[PDB]
From a paper:
The eukaryotic chaperonin TRiC/CCT assists the folding of about 10% of cytosolic proteins through an ATP-driven conformational cycle, and the essential cytoskeleton protein tubulin is the obligate substrate of TRiC. TRiC is the most complex chaperone system identified to date. It has a double-ring structure, and each ring consists of eight paralogous subunits (denoted as CCT1–CCT8) arranged in a specific order. Each TRiC subunit consists of three domains: the substrate-recognition apical domain (A domain) and the ATP-binding equatorial domain (E domain) linked by the intermediate domain (I domain). Here, we present an ensemble of cryo-EM structures of endogenous human TRiC throughout its ATPase cycle, with three of them revealing endogenously engaged tubulin in different folding stages.
Strikingly, in the closed-state TRiC-tubulin-S3 structure resolved to 3.1-Å resolution, we captured a near-natively folded tubulin and determined atomic details of the interaction between tubulin and TRiC. Importantly, inspection of our TRiC-tubulin-S3 map revealed a well-resolved tubulin density in one chamber of TRiC, hanging underneath the TRiC dome predominantly attached to the CCT6 hemisphere subunits (including CCT1/3/6/822,29). The tubulin density appeared to resemble the conformation of native tubulin, and hence we defined the captured tubulin as being in the near-natively folded state. Overall, the N and C domains of tubulin were relatively well resolved with atomic details observed. While the majority of the I domain of tubulin was captured, a small portion facing the central chamber was less well resolved, implying an intrinsically dynamic nature for this region. Inspection of the S3 map showed that tubulin engaged with TRiC mainly through its N/C domains, forming intimate salt-bridge- and H-bond-mediated contacts with all three domains of the CCT6 hemisphere subunits. The tubulin I domain also loosely interacted with CCT2 hemisphere subunits through association with the A-domain protrusion loop and C-termini of CCT7/5/2/4. Intriguingly, we observed the N-terminus of CCT8’ from the trans ring adopting a bent conformation and extending all the way to the cis-ring to associate with the tubulin N domain, in addition to being involved in the inter-ring allosteric network by linking the CCT6/6’ N-termini and CCT3 stem loop together. Notably, in the closed S3 state, we also resolved a portion of the C-terminal extension for most TRiC subunits (except CCT4), and captured the uncharacterized direct interactions between these C-terminal extensions of TRiC and tubulin. These C-terminal extensions, mostly hydrophilic, appeared stretched out from the surrounding subunits towards the center of the TRiC chamber to form physical contacts with tubulin, and hence appeared like a net holding and stabilizing tubulin within the TRiC chamber, which may facilitate folding of tubulin.
Residue numbers in the entry:
A (entry chain M): 50 to 441
B (entry chain N): 249 to 347
C (entry chain e): 78 to 538
D (entry chain O): 234 to 388
E (entry chain L): 7 to 529
F (entry chain a): 254 to 354
Write the structure that this text describes.
């Protein structure tokens, strides 16, 4: 009952208490946790359909659930299962030749052909009433990051999806810049035009080494040489940053020592520099490809060539669940994009995230094989009539 | 003990006896600062060591040891004194005359 | 390996353990003999004889069995070319185990493993020099006597040469690292000139520990502790293979097999403390990743290693226990070069000596000595029961032939080898093996006959 | 004809007084401390050497360094000896147990005739024999069970 | 010992239930994996009671017995027997389990015949010696004329993969198994063939990569592809070294000297990378992790940096590129660099892998297994591992025998010819040894559904007068020549099936008393 | 410390550095001091003597609403181009009446 545009979704409540609504066949079978050993192989069948194709995953259980159901009368007629496995391969090799004759060779330059392919996968989901906005945004999020007519592969890890609670599905955005969920400290500015963004992996704090370091104080004036020399150390780091010409700093999240101290925060606020902390180490690949920055580790190599560029780097104060960052425009943009997904409940956003991934995977299949067939039960009838004549 | 990580490395013989004398001279420094105004009653909220009682004994000073914080704010209005937290920063306006 | 909570049967466990610790061949026969002396004492107990009077009668009867066992005893072992009495002695011990498929191959392994490590001037054999290792795979016929040592090779570099033709082995006990003291240091660094002195200290230390091995002419290193990553590539540049993380007594066997000395530091290395070895290589066994060491050639080594292979771990752990009994009977021949003839031939001959001295004189202990002679016949009649024969039919024929003429080495066998002469069938056992079988079983019977009360508790809790 | 050196000292490299903090300032003096720790242990082994004491007995353990030093100089040692056995060993050879190795002489070392390590009962035993001025003895019991030898010891 | 039992919680049996529990527990092991023997045998699916059950379908007899956990004492000998067979030759673990169980089933028939069990051991030792000469005299050697040896290697991989899940993939997976060992050109290390399992696609979409695949993609701001590069790998620490002096601190008097030390620490880390790029390289592989400070130095110089591949990942790169590990950088004239053509990144199953295309001296391979489910990929990995281990020993021992039931009838004929030249005490035990050798083509014939009572009777009549290469044809269901059809197995595989089953049946038949101790925490 | 004569100069320095900041933020005309951290009993003496109001342990959300509405600058430490203690006294807030009712 969860197949086709007239199908209904299923809600699986786990033992922890995180009940989610899902319509994709791969996400349903991973949450049901079937105890039968033969039914767990059908869970991994829909998992590999999500990896290879992405949009085949309720239908692979209807076929494999019916191919074994057709073997009920075959095993009660004295047919050995090795004979059924030999004949199912001959029907499989003849089945691809029928689907290839129904295929029409298309080109990725036609936006109207790619639009009807992405709208088909959204008709079965909850966003079928939002196909006037999400299906145009699914094509533009792919065809701008693939660099077409030059490669037959596309990585979906370059398309980040940000889930924020608030508003409706019509409030989704296709901002091509960087969207961060971290807060701005200090948040006294939160907007800078013609911004130059720099990624800093150095810790702007007190000097300390990997080896054990201690300070020996054995004099009256030696306590004055500890605090005033630590202020002059980080002042040489802020003035090295300020003389470069950047206005937005992205500090990587440090675990061993403190990345940005309270003394370093006060000098960066007086230089009118927006500082953003807690950038993860696994997210620095997406930042350097989008804005065009370079990861700066040591402060002696922090030059103007390793900076980025942004026409507008502001913190959009949202009315819903807090606020986020949004960089608008950058010189020489990379092959990355960010999709902001909204929703009235926390359950609709998890379904809208899986429906967008089911829409981006449809255009992913058109990059690997530039051929498409008719849908809505069309090739299943032709596979049923041509293989019946082949069996005679 | 101060609010630090103070640790002394004692190498010579005269260093250990000097530290125990500097602890006695530090109490005599603050006891000499509170007798420049010539008081009669010293009232504090924390402990008073026996070395601090020795300088106040020969100066004829009656010392009360562990008066509460709420009772010190009440006697500051009755006698007209000011609760100071530094013996070397005492002034003539901080002495509660008129009691 | 039993869970017997019975204090009488616990003394039978320590009886078989005492035979294994002293001689190590008749651990099975010393329990059947002790149970035979107690079974014959059961009918003597019903006749009214005191249990100490039976125990005093067994001491006067076992003394005849010791003196009669020293009648025919001779060996011609010279450990040069007359190894034929040594092989046939080990075949009697290995004939009862599961190594009868390698009855001639594995018997010659245990003979040559003892004579290469034994001190003939003191008649002392040390079993710490005989390393018994086992690895699954191959067959029982692939068990070879490796003159040298077999350790788990742990070449830190995967591009190390796996075959050394002439190895000048440099045995050391210092890890390839900068020298760390045994006390608390907390070394202080003050300026940047001291931190640059830290880099040049370790860079020259790894070049000093590598050059001091190459100046001695060594081409192989053994180290007890671990290696550093910086010291691993310096081994490949200087063509110096080295193993890592060898055990405690494992490197003690390398310095004896190669004639080298174990050096504590790197500064005490010299050409005189190096070991000499021939084919040094690692051998991979099938699909595993063990790569044990094989030492083919040596020069007057006093340490050998037996590499037992098999089809499963059940046949290897038994062969480690079977061949250890074969290594013990060669050790007993160096302690005492007198032998007897097994197969029940010595028990029937000793049973006739007690019966002849039971009438000289039958005053009080006549019934106690005849119960000793009837219990000595249980061991040869148990061999007739396990061989499918009849016990009382076969024992009456063998015992009567030793009285009608002078008593030969006359026993029994399984396939019987034609005649029943143990001298022709080469069934040779040690004298002190059967001398301790009668001595330990008599004293264990005396401690379980001289007890008239049991004070065991009830439940556990 | 060996000589026995009864000791109460540790022959290990890690002999530490548990309160020493060797603060070093440079790398030239850092190597001098590590060379001094080997020179402390090797100076104790030179005191046992050059005195005829071929047999070494100590109630404190001996590490891998002093074990290999005596093997190269053809000397025997035995560490972790119980204190009840060293008191009997002192009255057997007629020597004295020296905690400090600096006062070793001919008047503190022992003297015997036959010293071998046999294989009685599987386990090894280092027995001393031949000393005529023996104020003690040792009665080795051999039996077939642990409870058998305990009754033999009680008898 | 049952009468007046002196045990606490332990039980035992002597000659009544000892051989009864030994024959029940060993036949039920052999009858379990009886249905998995042959080219038409089915497979098993192994499952647990719960708590991350991790279902693992296997057809190989070693992986079935190592996970069931049999409580029978005598059945653990046959479980450990198949474990050594997988570790030594990697094949015949199912064949050695049925053969060791059919010997004890024929030994159970000698219970009522009142045969002494030591006579059966002495009768089987002479039967095993006659069976060794049947395989040794029928072994076919291959020295020169390498175009017949490569054809002989495809018959070995075609016979091993026919009894596994890769049934109708012998046109592809035979070439993936023969050419993988043929590219080794040396010792069978069995670790240079790194098998990567990726979901998505059929088994026909699997292939053997001409280069090498890896993970842990190239840095952040580093180039993704360099043509005609010099590969240098490493096993050294990059950042946060704490270099080998335990008990060394930085004891200064002011905080300005701490800024001079941490700048001197980064200068020595910069000087270490400057010693690496003096070799003139374009790619860098470190076994340890590479932090951010040396990663910026490789990105500024246009050099790749592959951080934390694997402990055994630098060993396969050293065998596929022709370099060395080179953990110390102080002599550029003594460090041999690798060679490659393309270091482009490929995408297999929505995962970017580093493809080392066009490498020189490539003594390492990468099999990209693609399957429908994870259960197929776990079965095809063990099926390929059972095929690569035989070809790694066929190049070391080129002797091959004719399989498919032909080798078992040659061994059973040599025992039956010497069973008639023996007296009647041991001749009955030798006839039971020859009947168990004929059971191994009977299990193969009956698993397909053929008439096993007549096909083995036609094999026994053929081998009795000539026909040394006559075997069982499982394609049509008749008797054909094994040299024409090309069904051969290795000599060392068929010897270890005969020898280990004869030694394991010797142990269980010699057991007359099973004294099991009281277990712990079982009440 | 390696000399006992330098003991009391370090112990007095822990309060002299503390009282150095409290005298340069108070001599510029500041009467109401709000602090989100903590003012101990030793620092409360300098406000009673000078006649100033010192409020301690206020919320971080309440300090931003006061400093934005009164024109004050939320200062955390010392700043302004390698100065010892400057405090930027022209950036003080203003109020008509601060009365505790
Ligand atoms: N507009 C439409 N008209 C008719 N059928 C449709 C339409 N849109 C989608 N479908 C059908 O709905 C089905 C949805 O399948 P789906 O669950 O997405 O497969 P998978 O789980 O593999 O992604 C398709 O097989 C398609 O035939
Ligand atoms: N070829 C043979 N002929 C006759 N008897 C033999 C033969 N080989 C071994 N035996 C007998 O088998 C017995 C095995 O004793 P065993 O169990 O090995 O004693 P232990 O347990 O002390 O090792 C020996 O006492 C010996 O007399
Ligand atoms: N093409 C074939 N024709 C005839 N017999 C075959 C063929 N392929 C495989 N076999 C038989 O199937 C058996 C499979 O044994 P297998 O289960 O692989 O043993 P193991 O588990 O020890 O590897 C082999 O003994 C072989 O004789
Ligand atoms: Mg869909
Ligand atoms: Mg024996
Ligand atoms: Mg096989």
């Amino acid at each position: 009952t969860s197949l086709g545009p007239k199908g209904m979704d299923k809600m699986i409540q786990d033992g922890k208490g995180d009940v989610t609504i899902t319509n994709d066949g791969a996400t349903i079978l991973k949450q049901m946790q079937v105890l039968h050993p033969a039914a767990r192989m059908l869970v991994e069948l829909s998992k590999a359909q999500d990896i290879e194709a992405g949009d085949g995953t309720t239908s692979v259980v209807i076929i494999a659930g019916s191919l074994l159901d057709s073997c009920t009368k075959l095993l009660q007629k004295g047919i050995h299962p090795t004979i059924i496995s030999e004949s199912f391969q001959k029907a499989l090799e003849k089945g691809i030749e029928i689907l290839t004759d129904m295929s029409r060779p298309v080109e990725l330059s036609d936006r109207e052909t790619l639009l009807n392919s992405a709208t088909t996968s959204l008709n079965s989901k909850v966003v079928s009433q939002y196909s006037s906005l999400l299906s145009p945004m699914s094509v533009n999020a792919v065809m701008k990051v693939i660099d077409p007519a030059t490669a037959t592969s596309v990585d979906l890890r370059d398309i980040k999806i940000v889930k924020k609670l608030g508003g409706t599905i019509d409030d989704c955005e296709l901002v091509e810049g960087l969207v961060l969920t971290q807060k701005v400290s200090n948040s006294g500015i939160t907007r800078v035009e013609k911004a130059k963004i720099g990624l800093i992996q150095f810790c702007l704090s007190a000097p300390k080494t990997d080896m054990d370091n201690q300070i020996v104080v054995s004099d009256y004036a030696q306590m004055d040489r500890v605090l005033r020399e630590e202020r002059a150390y980080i002042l040489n780091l802020v003035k090295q940053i300020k003389k470069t010409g950047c206005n937005v700093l992205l500090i990587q999240k440090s675990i061993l020592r403190d990345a940005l101290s309270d003394l370093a925060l006060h000098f960066l606020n007086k230089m009118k520099i927006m500082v953003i902390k807690d950038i993860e180490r696994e997210d620095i690949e997406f930042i350097c490809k989008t804005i065009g920055t370079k990861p700066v580790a040591h402060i002696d190599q922090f030059t103007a060539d390793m900076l980025g560029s942004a026409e507008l780097a502001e913190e959009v104060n949202l009315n819903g669940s807090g606020k986020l960052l949004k960089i608008t425009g950058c010189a020489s943009p990379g092959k990355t994009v960010t999709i902001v997904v909204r929703g009235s409940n926390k359950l609709v956003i998890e379904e809208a995230e899986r429906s967008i991934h089911d829409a981006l995977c449809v255009i992913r299949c058109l990059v690997k094989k530039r051929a498409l067939i008719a849908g809505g039960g069309a090739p299943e009838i032709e596979l049923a009539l041509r293989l019946t004549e082949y069996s005679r | 003990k101060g609010e630090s990580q103070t640790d002394i490395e004692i190498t010579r013989e005269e260093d250990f006896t000097r530290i125990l004398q500097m602890e006695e001279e530090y109490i005599q420094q603050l006891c000499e600062d509170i007798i420049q105004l010539k008081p009669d009653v010293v009232i504090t909220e924390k402990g008073i060591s026996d070395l601090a009682q020795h300088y106040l004994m020969r100066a004829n000073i009656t010392a009360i040891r562990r008066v509460r914080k709420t009772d010190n704010n009440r006697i500051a209005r009755a006698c007209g004194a000011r609760i100071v937290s530094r013996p070397e920063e005492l002034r003539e306006d901080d002495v509660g005359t008129g009691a | 390996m039993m869970d017997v909570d019975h204090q009488i049967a616990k003394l039978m466990v320590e009886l078989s353990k005492s035979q294994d610790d002293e001689i190590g061949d008749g651990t099975t026969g010393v329990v059947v003999l002790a149970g035979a002396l107690l079974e014959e004492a059961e009918q003597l107990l019903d006749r009214g004889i005191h249990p100490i009077r039976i125990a005093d009668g067994y001491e006067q009867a076992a003394r005849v069995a010791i003196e009669h066992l020293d009648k025919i005893s001779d060996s011609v072992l010279v450990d040069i070319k007359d190894t034929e009495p040594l092989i046939q002695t080990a075949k009697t011990t290995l004939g009862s185990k599961v190594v009868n498929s390698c009855h001639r191959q594995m018997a010659e392994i245990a003979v040559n493993a003892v004579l290469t490590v034994a001190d003939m001037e003191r008649r002392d054999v040390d079993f710490e020099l005989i390393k018994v290792e086992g690895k699954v795979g191959g067959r029982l016929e692939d068990t070879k006597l490796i003159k040298g040592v077999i350790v788990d090779k742990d070449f830190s570099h995967p591009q190390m040469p796996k075959k050394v033709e002439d190895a000048k082995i440099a045995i050391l006990t210092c890890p390839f690292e900068p020298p760390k003291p045994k006390t608390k240091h907390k070394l202080d660094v003050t300026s940047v000139e001291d931190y640059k002195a830290l880099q040049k200290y370790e860079k020259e230390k790894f070049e000093e520990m590598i050059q001091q091995i190459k100046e001695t002419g060594a081409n192989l290193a053994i180290c007890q502790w671990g290696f550093d990553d910086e010291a691993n590539h310096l081994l490949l540049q200087n063509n110096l293979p080295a193993v890592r993380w060898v055990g405690g007594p494992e490197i003690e066997l390398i310095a004896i097999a190669t004639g080298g000395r174990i050096v504590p530091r790197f500064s005490e290395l010299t050409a005189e403390k190096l070991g000499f070895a021939g084919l040094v290589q690692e051998i991979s066994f099938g699909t595993t990743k063990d790569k044990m060491l094989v030492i083919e050639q040596c020069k007057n080594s006093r340490a050998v290693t037996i590499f037992i292979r098999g089809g499963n771990k059940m046949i290897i752990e038994e062969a480690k226990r079977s061949l250890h009994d074969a290594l013990c009977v060669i050790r007993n021949l160096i302690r005492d070069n007198r032998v007897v003839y097994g197969g029940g031939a010595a028990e029937i001959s000793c049973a006739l000596a007690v019966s002849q001295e039971a009438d000289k004189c039958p005053t009080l202990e006549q019934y106690a000595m005849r119960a000793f002679a009837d219990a000595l016949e249980v061991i040869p009649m148990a061999l007739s029961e396990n061989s499918g024969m009849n016990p009382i039919q076969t024992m009456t024929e063998v015992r009567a032939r030793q009285v009608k003429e002078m008593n030969p080495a006359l026993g029994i066998d399984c396939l019987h080898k034609g005649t029943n002469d143990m001298k022709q069938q080469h069934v040779i056992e040690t004298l002190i093996g059967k001398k301790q079988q009668i001595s330990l079983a008599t004293q264990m019977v005396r401690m379980i006959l001289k007890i008239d009360d049991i004070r065991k508790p009830g439940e556990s809790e | 004809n060996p000589k026995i050196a009864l000791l109460n000292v540790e022959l290990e490299l890690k002999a530490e007084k548990d309160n020493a903090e060797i603060r070093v300032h440079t790398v030239e003096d850092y190597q001098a401390i590590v060379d001094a720790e080997w020179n402390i242990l090797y100076d104790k082994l030179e005191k046992i050497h050059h005195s005829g004491a071929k047999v070494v007995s100590s109630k404190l353990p001996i590490g891998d360094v002093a074990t290999q030093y005596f093997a190269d100089r053809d000397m025997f040692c035995a560490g972790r000896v119980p204190e009840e056995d060293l008191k009997r060993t002192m009255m057997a050879c007629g020597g004295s147990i020296q905690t400090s190795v600096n006062a070793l002489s001919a008047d503190v070392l022992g003297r015997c005739q036959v010293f071998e390590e046999t294989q009685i009962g599987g386990e090894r035993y280092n027995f001393f024999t031949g000393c005529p001025k023996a104020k003690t003895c040792t009665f080795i019991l051999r039996g077939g069970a642990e409870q058998f030898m305990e009754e033999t010891e009680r008898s | 010992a049952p009468v007046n039992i002196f045990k606490a919680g332990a039980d035992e049996e002597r000659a009544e239930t000892a051989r009864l529990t030994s024959f029940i527990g060993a036949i039920a092991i052999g009858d379990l994996v009886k249905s998995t023997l042959g080219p038409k045998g089915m497979d098993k699916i192994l499952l647990s009671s719960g708590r991350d059950a991790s279902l693992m379908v296997t057809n190989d007899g070693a992986t079935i017995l190592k996970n069931i956990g049999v409580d029978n004492p005598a059945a653990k000998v046959l479980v450990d027997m198949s474990r050594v067979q997988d570790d030594e030759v990697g094949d015949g673990t199912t064949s050695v389990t049925v053969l060791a169980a059919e010997l004890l089933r024929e030994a159970e028939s000698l219970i009522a015949k009142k045969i002494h069990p030591q006579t059966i051991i002495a009768g089987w030792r002479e039967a095993t010696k006659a069976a060794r000469e049947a395989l040794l005299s029928s072994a076919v050697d291959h020295g020169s004329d390498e175009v017949k040896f490569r054809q002989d290697l495809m018959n070995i991989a075609g016979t091993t993969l026919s009894s596994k899940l890769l049934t109708h993939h012998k046109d592809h997976f035979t070439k993936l198994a023969v050419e993988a060992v043929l590219r080794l050109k040396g010792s069978g290390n069995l670790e240079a063939i790194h098998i990567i399992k990726k979901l998505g696609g059929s088994l026909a979409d699997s292939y053997l990569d001409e280069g090498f695949l890896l993970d842990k993609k190239i840095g952040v701001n580093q180039p993704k592809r360099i043509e005609n590069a010099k590969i240098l790998i490493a096993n050294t620490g990059m950042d946060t070294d704490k270099i080998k002096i335990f008990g060394s601190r930085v004891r200064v008097d002011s905080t300005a000297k701490v800024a001079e030390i941490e700048h001197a620490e980064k200068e020595k880390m910069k000087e270490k990378v400057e010693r690496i790029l003096k070799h003139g390289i374009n790619c860098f592989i470190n076994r340890q992790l590479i932090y951010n400070y040396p990663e910026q130095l490789f990105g500024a110089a246009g050099v790749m940096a592959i951080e934390h591949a694997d402990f055994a990942g630098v060993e396969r790169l050293a065998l596929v590129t022709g370099g060395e590990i080179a953990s110390t950088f102080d002599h550029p004239e003594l460090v041999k660099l690798g060679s490659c053509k393309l270091i482009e990144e490929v995408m297999i199953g929505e995962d970017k892998l580093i493809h080392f295309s066009g490498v020189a001296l490539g003594e390492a391979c990468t099999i990209v297994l693609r399957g429908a489910t994870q259960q197929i990929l776990d079965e095809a990995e063990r099926s390929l591992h059972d095929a690569l281990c035989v070809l790694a020993q066929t190049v070391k021992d080129s002797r091959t025998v004719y399989g498919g039931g032909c080798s078992e009838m040659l061994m059973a004929h040599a025992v039956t010819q010497l069973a008639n030249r023996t007296p009647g005490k041991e001749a009955v035990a030798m006839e039971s040894y020859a009947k168990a050798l004929r059971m191994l083509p009977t299990i193969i014939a009956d698993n397909a559904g053929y008439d096993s009572a007549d096909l083995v009777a036609q094999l026994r009549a053929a081998h009795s007068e000539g026909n040394t290469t006559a075997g069982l044809d499982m394609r049509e269901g008749t008797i054909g020549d094994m040299a024409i059809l090309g069904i051969t197995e290795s000599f060392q595989v068929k010897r270890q099936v005969l020898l280990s089953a004869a030694e394991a049946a010797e142990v269980i038949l010699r057991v007359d008393n099973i004294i099991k101790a009281a277990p712990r925490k079982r009440v | 410390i390696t000399d006992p004569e330098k003991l009391d100069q370090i112990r007095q320095r822990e309060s002299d550095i503390t009282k150095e900041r409290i005298q340069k933020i108070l001599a510029t005309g500041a009467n109401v001091i709000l602090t989100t951290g903590g003012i101990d009993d030793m620092c409360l003496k300098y406000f009673v003597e000078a006649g100033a109001m010192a409020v301690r342990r206020v919320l971080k959300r309440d300090l931003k609403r006061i400093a934005k509405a009164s024109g004050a600058t939320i200062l955390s430490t010392l700043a302004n181009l390698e100065g010892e203690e400057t405090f930027e006294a022209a950036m003080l807030g203003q109020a008509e009446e601060v009365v505790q009712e």
